[PDB]
């Protein structure tokens with residue numbers, strides 16, 4: 011019982027302290043970090059990292075916190091990193107969060123707030139019953155919780171504290187980073203990979219037990235402008251050209267089923283975001299997504315070919331194409347160092363956790379960092395229902411996440 | 427030569443006086459008439475009508491001028507009317523018009539303005555050469571001319587002056603009206619049909635020689651709102667519903683060739699005016715037009731049926747239809763008194779004019795007046811290139827228009 015007692019206690023102590031700090035980010039601010047709460051949280055973590063005993067504890071002028079757990083081995087082991095973000099979602103308030111601890115959960119509905127009649131139900135959240143017997147933490151219904159990503163951050167702190175206090179567990183050098191403004195898309199913008207100094211890293215910002223993510227979409231955006239000629243409707247024969255119809259003609263050339271509303275898993279798509287215009291001019295916006303690089307390029311070429319075909323029919327000025335790549339599949343950067351996914355998978359299996367591979371049907375900080383030279387899979391944290399008042403987390407699962415971090419560290423050293 | 431000498435002289439004298447008065451209308455004004463120039467023109471015409479010798483010469487508080495040519499017959503003849511509008515187009519300035527008289531026209535290009543290099547060419551206007559030998563009046567390239575509709579108005583004045591001075595030509599009572607704000611769509615709004623007191627009338631607001639119009643579109647307008655559900659693209663399967671695609675699905679059910687850009691003559695259509703929206707909501711505007719009443723109603727029912735079909739597929743709230751009739755085919759009102767078209771046709775043939783029937787692929791003041799209880803065909807005036815700096819008119823054709831008015835009046839009396 012000793013190991014679990016110590017870990018559960020510490021997880022709850024740190025997590026409840028962190029969620030009580032307002033760290034919501036705000037895109038309307040242009041400082042880095044965007045909100046002062048992130049600076050308060052960072053300064054608190056700097057002191058916590060120093061008290062645990064990590065070295066090289068820094069917080070840069072942009073609020074990025076980094077620290078080192080020195081190697082504890084005679085072997086040459088790659089430097090590995092663990093990452094988490096400081097901020098909470100812009101969707102709902104993260105101010106004055108009142109965490110509620112529900113031990114030995116019965117798997118039934120939880121009344122978060124009697125006065126406001128706010129109830130967390132299994133009907134609305136079918137995964138709720140699977141947490142029977144766990145210790146879960148919820149909000150009081152008036153705020154989100156911030157398990158995304160204070161649960162992952164807590165797990166890193168608890169795992170580092172465990173390692174430094176268990177020198178019999180050998181490991182190479184480990185770097186940790188706590189970063190601002192992930193929720194507004196600015197996290198990687200000021201992440202200094204050279205300063206971080208790791209070969210690869212694990213982002214602790216997944217969700218439920220077993221989550222492992224390391225593949226993401228290739229992405230491009232396109233804007234099509236169609237130009238026509240308006241005339242009085244009555245005298246339009248062989249003179250009028252309806253730009254809106256040209257837009258519909260363009261869309262008609264795309265495979266109807268290759269759209270987000272019909273696809274999942276690794277299936278790609280074309281997605282029509284908007285169409286605005288009239289007879290004289292119409293503008294359509296699309297995104298193009300595919301996990302397979304060859305097929306992604308083929309989707310872009312399909313658009314080019316349709317445009318060429320319509321320009322030959324209506325003239326070069328009738329169709330104008332703006333198209334630019336946006337981001338790429340992180341698997342391309344993981345492949346040369348694929349053992350980093352194998353070690354995470356093996357770590358989970360060794361702890362009797364069934365891994366759940368989740369393709370990232372979009373882009374994340376981990377997928378962008380991968381592109382920047384820091385291959386970074388995303389690992390589960392135990393959180394559910396992120397970005398709203400019904401957010402909750404299983405402390406039992408948080409403990410499993412800590413165990414995974416420890417096992418990954420030991421495994422890199424053992425295999426070196 | 428006497429008849430033609432007198433008529434050409436008078437046509438040019440009156441027409442050139444009228445075009446020099448700025449009578450452009452302005453929709454931004456909400457007085458009736460919208461501009462003071464129309465009041466000046468009306469007051470001038472009241473005095474001109476009195477000097478010709480017409481009776482019951484009135485100008486109401488809204489600027490509508492009416493007058494009577496008393497019957498000159500012992501027979502019971504229906505009261506017939508002749509109409510023209512006071513205002514010029516909003517498209518180009520009608521201020522300080524400088525009419526140019528080109529006698530014995532050679533059918534070649536006319537330099538309207540040497541200083542600004544403005545030239546009226548047969549390449550740009552292929553009908554120009556057909557006027558070889560005529561006396562034509564043009565602008566100086568800095569204004570429009572106002573033949574629309576001061577040519578028709580002049581023709582009415584010259585015809586009434588001719589009738590009163592030729593009492594040997596028998597006719598029933600004739601009423602004339604000169605109306606403001608036709609060019610901004612407000613003419614019929616304050617036209618008092620009861621006060622006008624005619625069974626039917628002829629609008630002198632056609633164009634080239636032989637023009638005769640008495641059939642117009644039935645019309646309805648529709649606005650379709652499509653409602654969908656937006657989601658993150660990556661997690662859209664069986665959740666997202668793209669409103670813009672619903673709009674395209676709706677349009678796809680309509681016959682592609684039944685559109686203004688592929689139709690002429692009596693062919694009807696559906697016309698997509700605009701489409702604006704995104705995944706959550708999209709709005710399309712259409713007009714529906716058909717000369718045949720049964721087919722017009724069938725087009726409306728087709729739209730209703732498509733909406734019903736889509737509501738059964740997606741739910742009642744997914745598609746919202748606003749649809750209202752706008753105006754109707756004047757032929758329905760002409761049919762009970764069809765002899766009024768026969769008399770105009772016969773009048774033209776008797777003067778060796780080949781009638782040119784022009785379906786009205788829209789709505790006009792004549793078609794709206796018909797609906798209001800005053801069946802009103804539109805007769806040619808001799809004007810070409812209306813609403814711009816290249817507007818011109820054939821005085822030879824103006825003379826033919828005067829002859830047509832006279833013949834129509836005599837013919838009603840002869841057939842009574």
Ligand SMILES: OC[C@H]1O[C@@](CO)(O[C@H]2O[C@H](CO)[C@@H](O)[C@H](O)[C@H]2O)[C@@H](O)[C@@H]1O
Nearest residue numbers: 301302303304305306339341342343345
């Ligand atoms: O041979 C490359 C070709 O193979 C595809 C699958 O048809 O992708 C495979 O190879 C990629 C490049 O090494 C891997 O990243 C990918 O995971 C693998 O399936 C095509 O996409 C690619 O053009």
Ligand SMILES: OC[C@H]1O[C@@](CO)(O[C@H]2O[C@H](CO)[C@@H](O)[C@H](O)[C@H]2O)[C@@H](O)[C@@H]1O
Nearest residue numbers: 208209210343346347380382383384385
């Ligand atoms: O640690 C992986 C990370 O480092 C970079 C830096 O250039 O690549 C290095 O490591 C790769 C994996 O072993 C080698 O293939 C490569 O030659 C070496 O430069 C990044 O490209 C990569 O993401």
Ligand SMILES: OC[C@H]1O[C@@](CO)(O[C@H]2O[C@H](CO)[C@@H](O)[C@H](O)[C@H]2O)[C@@H](O)[C@@H]1O
Nearest residue numbers: 717718719720721722755757758759761
């Ligand atoms: O029988 C009426 C029926 O005939 C159509 C032609 O198919 O129209 C004709 O009859 C109308 C009603 O009297 C006329 O106005 C029209 O000009 C004539 O062609 C249908 O439109 C109508 O339903």
Ligand SMILES: OC[C@H]1O[C@@](CO)(O[C@H]2O[C@H](CO)[C@@H](O)[C@H](O)[C@H]2O)[C@@H](O)[C@@H]1O
Nearest residue numbers: 624625626759762763796798799800801
């Ligand atoms: O002058 C035609 C005009 O008068 C109205 C007025 O009611 O109809 C009258 O004349 C018709 C044509 O002879 C008759 O069929 C009708 O009964 C009579 O009232 C208008 O309806 C019509 O446009």
Ligand code: NA
Nearest residue numbers: 371372373374
């Ligand atoms: Na994304």
Ligand code: NA
Nearest residue numbers: 787788789790
């Ligand atoms: Na019209």
Ligand SMILES: [Zn+2]
Nearest residue numbers: 095158159215
């Ligand atoms: Zn997160």
Ligand SMILES: [Zn+2]
Nearest residue numbers: 099158193396
């Ligand atoms: Zn988040």
Ligand SMILES: [Zn+2]
Nearest residue numbers: 511574575631
């Ligand atoms: Zn006119």
Ligand SMILES: [Zn+2]
Nearest residue numbers: 515574609812
């Ligand atoms: Zn006009």
